[PDB]
């Protein structure tokens, strides 16, 4: 038993809620929140911009030190950094950005990072401003992630479509 409230159960291990991931993290303070990162950990917009703004830019300061030391992530890759005021840890995951020509086949690799953590609060990877079909992203999530994932979907209209079309 955990702190997540009001999620709809999709599968044995996947749960979903219409919620702003920024607000959900501040309330729950989960062990792991997933960020929809890019390879530079430049948290300008989307989920990453919103999470970073909620940390008062501390997430960006930590991220720039990480890149200065380690270089960019891979598309499909991840790193674990502080969760600041939002979570114990932030798992920064790079889904493919369709708008940049990145291979959508890398979405499954991206979601495999989630399997290194027992429970996560997460957005749909490659959704929103990363340009992928969210219905596809939820299908890959369900077919790839075996640990317990609590999905926050910001858009109420998209949430309803995701639930109503879910096989
Ligand atoms: N209401 S917000 O914190 O400014 C915000 N922006 C967001 C973009 C993508 C996903 C969740 C978001 N939340």
UniProtKB/Swiss-Prot annotation:
Residues 1-167 form the Macro domain. Inhibited in vitro by GRL-0617. It catalyses: Thiol-dependent hydrolysis of ester, thioester, amide, peptide and isopeptide bonds formed by the C-terminal Gly of ubiquitin (a 76-residue protein attached to proteins as an intracellular targeting signal). It is found in: Host endoplasmic reticulum membrane. Changing residue 164 to L: In strain: Gamma/P.1. It is a multi-pass membrane protein. It comes from the Viruses. May form homohexamers. Interacts with N protein. Responsible for the cleavages located at the N-terminus of the replicase polyprotein. Participates together with nsp4 in the assembly of virally-induced cytoplasmic double-membrane vesicles necessary for viral replication. Antagonizes innate immune induction of type I interferon by blocking the phosphorylation, dimerization and subsequent nuclear translocation of host IRF3. Also prevents host NF-kappa-B signaling. In addition, PL-PRO possesses a deubiquitinating/deISGylating activity and processes both 'Lys-48'- and 'Lys-63'-linked polyubiquitin chains from cellular substrates. This is Papain-like protease nsp3. The gene is rep.
């Amino acid at each position: 038993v955990n702190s997540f409230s009001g999620y709809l159960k999709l599968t044995d291990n996947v749960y979903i809620k219409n919620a702003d991931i920024v607000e959900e993290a501040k309330k729950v303070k989960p062990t792991v929140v997933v960020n929809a990162a890019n390879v530079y950990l430049k948290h300008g917009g989307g989920v990453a911009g919103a999470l970073n703004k909620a940390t008062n830019n501390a997430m960006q300061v930590e991220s720039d030190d990480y890149i200065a030391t380690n270089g960019p992530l891979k598309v499909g890759g991840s790193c674990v950094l502080s969760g600041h005021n939002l979570a114990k840890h932030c798992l920064h995951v790079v889904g493919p950005n369709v708008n940049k020509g990145e291979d959508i086949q890398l979405l499954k690799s991206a979601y495999e990072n989630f399997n290194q953590h027992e429970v996560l609060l997460a957005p749909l990877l490659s959704a929103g401003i990363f340009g992928a079909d969210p219905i596809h992203s939820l299908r890959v999530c369900v077919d790839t992630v075996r640990t317990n994932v609590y999905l926050a979907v910001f858009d109420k209209n998209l949430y309803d479509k995701l639930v109503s079309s879910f096989l």
